[PDB]
């Protein structure tokens, strides 16, 4: 591997038909014979790590033990129709016979397996990058032959990107993708964020902050990843484990008690529906359920009770879940607005923005990148614009001890931890919690769950207090949550017509105060009549609660005009009523939804119509790639795809700096500058070797 | 061809074989995909309206008890929402297809102590039923056609 | 899927489908791996025939 | 018809130049090409 | 008319030319179905 890391390093900024990688292709050649038992070798324990776990291969194993025999594995093999005689000799050689000619395959499979696996990677990583720089050599594709079940073993592994690199050339960068990391993208909620960042990106984004962005949604993915680690499952330390256990059960099942919330809660108002008020007792009246099987007045209490119970571990499962993210992100946006903005150091936002006025409350903490990894952040802040603001009143801002910082340089101080709770009750930062909580009280789902905590109590004293709770199916079904955003969509005109509608129906009851108050007697009585408009908040009432609920407008319920001095002019105050009111102001309401449902679906479309005809990193639409057969697939697949881009960066920050290729250190500078000029904008491999590949 | 045979145990089985032009007829089943096409988002829409009923419904069954009295009759009355079922039944039966809700079928609240808390009850009650809802209905199929 | 089941070991399943070699290529292209006999099994086939 | 007006006139501006006509995907062959062109290049603010 | 319908409507690139092969057989199928059932 040593050997091979060195050769790829040959490689470095080599064009397609380079002079290096041409040489390289000789030197395969001239030891052919050499790698070809190379790639024998890997193959070989690659196909006998699948045959042990074949099913043809359980039916010649027959030693209860678990063991099978020299003749018999030599039967066995062949009948697998995969190796030839002297393979399967070499392989009886290599499997550990003992004197009775017995032999264990589990281990044998295994043996090679681990110790073959960073060698393997790196020869399919070599192969690779040859064969796509030097596409046209006959010599080439018979190793790629010979290595094909090294190449489709390693596939889903060996992650490919191309950037813009340090010779002012797109190049095409090959590292390794872990298993766990690859498994942990391909998680189902992991899946909807990005569904759902491509979305706001593509909709609601712009190109210059395209890639940065990006980069954030890597940055939130990767927090994520280790939320959902550790919420993972394979006497004070007694109850900590089981509490850290409870908890973490909370997070992992936090939509499964969501759901089971919303089915409590549509139990308890079909019991609801069986209420019932009488005079007797089961002047004051008496609310009681009426049913004859007596099972469920209890039921209520029990699945009031539970409900309540349900709905609290979603707090604490919200706050375990999502809580760290939110405060991620706030914690990095600060951050970096401190060190790449100077936001308290040079603007200092003037008292209208609640987010970075509550801001300042966290800066000086001891406890601030509580969640953010870079727990250096005022050490860089210093160094950056200390010089010019003062080092000491930078300091005095973040609450730094200046004569500290050598110190923890000059050597490391191993105290004593001890495991008492009154040793930590002064251990807690008690200013970063109320900002803290803040942030937390400030979020909108929280808030929204909060607010089910307290109906839900206020349930148990009225239980008719939880049919609110059947609301939660806006939220509980995303489908719902659809047709309710075509009408918060256009919200802000929804209210301003009702308004419109106010003042419109204001006006009509003023000339009705003055002209036609006769016509407003809404008494059969002779004697007692009901006057309706003798005072305009009567009758501005009048109008706003019968007129504009009547089908036919004001006209339907005040007393008919037939044969009176002001016949011409009401009729023209009726159906102007009812052409404005009822006909064309209730029909802007109904477009707005209308419009809506319209405006977002092309939205969807929108997005779904970009992502599928341009490439959503370099930008080139579809067509120049589908001049090649599948081009545009093999390009998001290959080539650009962002799923990779996500993968290079945690592979960046796992591995070693000491450790970093010429081209890896390139990206790891640039993205810790905040500098994404290494992304292909415009351009790709393809394109610019278009003369050469093709 | 079942449709058939029961028409034979009674003849005004075969008026079921008239929806037969939904599909005999491509221009109405062009125009019944145009109401199918969102189906889902339909039935989740009348099941919103269904909730929405009942959160009115539970309301006046805890406060605007008194004027659910439908009965011109003096001394026995029929009140509606005595019982909560038969309550929610009221509304989803009678305030759905009032033209201006439930407030077109419960008694007047003029000169009551819970005046202003009704006609707020019954505005609401026609602006989100009525209008909204039924707009949302009206469009999801406009939107289908479109 | 699962109700695909019951026609595998038909010996007329592919009776409308034009290619009545299928359970031929299928044991010529599988039987090395999972057993011969299985995929006969599998597929209602005599091998002496 | 009013809103695929906004639309439409925000579509124009963000996809072509309102000076020389050349519309985006020219100039982003360039990393950002379309933004320095509008702002620096030919931007109408400088031939007021 | 149909099958174009579905493959430009709702089809992708990676499957349109199996799904028009597919289609060709089954239109093969139905030309069989017609012959047989044709009367002289
Ligand atoms: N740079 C890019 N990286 C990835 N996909 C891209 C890129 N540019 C455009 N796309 C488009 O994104 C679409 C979504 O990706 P794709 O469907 O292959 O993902 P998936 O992981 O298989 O799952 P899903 O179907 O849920 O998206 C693709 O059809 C592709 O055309
Ligand atoms: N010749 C041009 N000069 C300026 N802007 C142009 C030109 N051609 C197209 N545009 C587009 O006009 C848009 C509006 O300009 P821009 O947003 O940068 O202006 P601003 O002064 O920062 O403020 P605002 O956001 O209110 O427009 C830009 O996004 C740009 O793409
Ligand atoms: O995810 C991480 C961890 C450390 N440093 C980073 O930049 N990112
Ligand atoms: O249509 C047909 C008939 C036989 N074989 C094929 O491949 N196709
Ligand atoms: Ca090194
Ligand atoms: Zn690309
Ligand atoms: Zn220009």
Redesign the interface.
């Known amino acids: 591997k040593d050997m091979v890391v060195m050769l790829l390093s040959l490689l470095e900024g080599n064009v397609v038909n380079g002079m290096i990688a041409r040489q390289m292709v000789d030197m395969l050649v001239e030891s052919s014979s050499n790698v070809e038992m190379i790639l024998k070798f890997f193959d070989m324990f690659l196909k006998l790590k699948d045959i042990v776990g074949?099913?043809?291969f359980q039916?010649y194993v027959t030693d209860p033990r678990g063991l099978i025999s020299k003749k018999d594995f030599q039967k066995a093999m062949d009948?697998?129709?995969?190796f030839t005689g002297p393979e399967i000799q070499f392989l009886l050689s290599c499997s550990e016979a003992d004197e009775n000619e017995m032999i264990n395959f589990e281990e044998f499979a295994n043996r090679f397996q681990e110790p073959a696996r960073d060698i393997g990677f790196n020869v399919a990583v070599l192969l690779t990058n040859l064969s796509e720089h030097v596409p046209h050599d006959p010599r080439l594709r018979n190793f790629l032959e010979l290595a094909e079940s090294i190449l489709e073993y390693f596939r889903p592994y060996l992650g490919r990107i191309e950037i813009?690199g340090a010779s002012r050339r797109i190049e095409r960068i090959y590292f390794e993708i872990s298993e766990t990391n690859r498994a942990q993208w391909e998680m189902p909620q992991v899946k909807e964020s990005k569904r759902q960042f491509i979305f706001d990106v593509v909709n609601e984004g712009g190109?210059?902050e395209k890639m940065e962005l990006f980069v954030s949604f890597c940055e939130d993915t990767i927090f994520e990843m280790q939320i959902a680690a550790q919420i993972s499952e394979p006497f004070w330390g007694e109850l900590e484990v089981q509490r850290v256990k409870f908890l973490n059960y909370l997070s992992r099942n936090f939509y499964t008690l969501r759901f089971l919330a919303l089915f409590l809660a549509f139990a308890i108002?079909f019991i609801?529906?069986?209420?019932?008020?009488?005079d007797s007792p089961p002047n004051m009246v008496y609310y009681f359920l009426?049913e004859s099987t007596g099972y469920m007045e209890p039921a209520l209490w029990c699945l009031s009770l539970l409900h309540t119970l349900v709905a609290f571990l979603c707090i604490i499962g919200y706050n375990c879940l999502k809580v760290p993210l939110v405060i991620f992100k706030r914690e990095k946006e600060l951050a970096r607005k401190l060190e790449f903005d100077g936001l308290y150091i040079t603007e200092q936002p003037g008292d209208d923005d609640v987010k970075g006025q509550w801001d300042r409350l966290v800066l000086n903490t001891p406890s601030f990148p509580s969640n953010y990894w870079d727990k250096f952040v005022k050490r860089k802040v210093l160094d950056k614009h200390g010089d010019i603001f003062g080092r000491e009143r930078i300091a005095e801002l973040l609450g730094m001890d200046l004569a500290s910082l050598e110190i923890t340089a000059h050597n490391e101080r191993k105290p004593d931890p001890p495991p008492g709770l009154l040793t930590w009750l002064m251990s807690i930062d008690v200013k970063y919690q109320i900002w803290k909580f803040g942030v937390i009280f400030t979020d909108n789902s929280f808030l929204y769950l909060g607010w089910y905590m307290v109906m839900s109590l206020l349930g148990h004293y009225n239980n008719?207090f939880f049919?609110?709770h059947?609301?939660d199916?806006?939220m509980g079904?995303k489908?719902?949550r659809?047709?309710?955003s075509?009408?918060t969509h256009n919200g802000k005109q929804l209210v301003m017509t009702?308004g419109l509608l106010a003042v419109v129906v204001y006006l009509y009851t003023v000339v009705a105060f003055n002209f036609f108050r006769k016509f407003y007697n809404?008494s059969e009585d002779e004697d007692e009549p009901?006057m309706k408009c003798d005072d305009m908040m009567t009758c501005y009432?009048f109008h706003?609660?019968?007129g504009?609920?009547?089908?036919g407008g004001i006209g339907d319920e005040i007393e008919d005009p037939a044969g009176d001095e002001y016949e011409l002019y009401r009729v023209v105050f009726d159906i102007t009523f009812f052409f404005f009111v009822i006909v064309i102001l209730?029909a802007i309401?109904?477009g707005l939804?209308?419009?809506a449902?319209?405006?977002l679906?092309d939205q969807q479309e929108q997005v779904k119509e970009d992502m599928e005809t341009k490439c959503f990193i370099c930008?080139i639409?579809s067509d120049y790639f589908?001049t090649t057969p599948?081009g545009?697939?093999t390009h998001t697949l290959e080539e650009h795809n962002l799923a990779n881009y996500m993968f290079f960066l945690m592979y960046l920050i796992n591995k070693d700096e000491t450790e970093h290729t010429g081209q890896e250190s390139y990206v790891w500078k640039m993205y810790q500058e905040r500098c994404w000029?290494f992304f292909p904008?415009?351009?790709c491999f393809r394109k610019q070797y278009e003369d050469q590949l093709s």
Do not use: C, P, W
């Not at 009948?79 to 995969?82: A, I, L, V």
């Not at 609801?272 to 009488?278: H, I, R």
């Not at 504009?548 to 089908?551: D, K």
């Open positions: 074949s099913e043809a039916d009948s697998q129709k995969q813009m190109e210059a108002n609801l529906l069986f209420y019932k008020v009488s009426e008719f049919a609110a059947l609301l199916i806006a079904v489908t719902l659809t047709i309710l075509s009408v009702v809404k009901d009432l706003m609660y019968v504009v609920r009547a089908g209730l309401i109904q939804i209308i419009d449902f319209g405006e679906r930008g639409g589908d599948h545009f697939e000029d904008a415009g351009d």
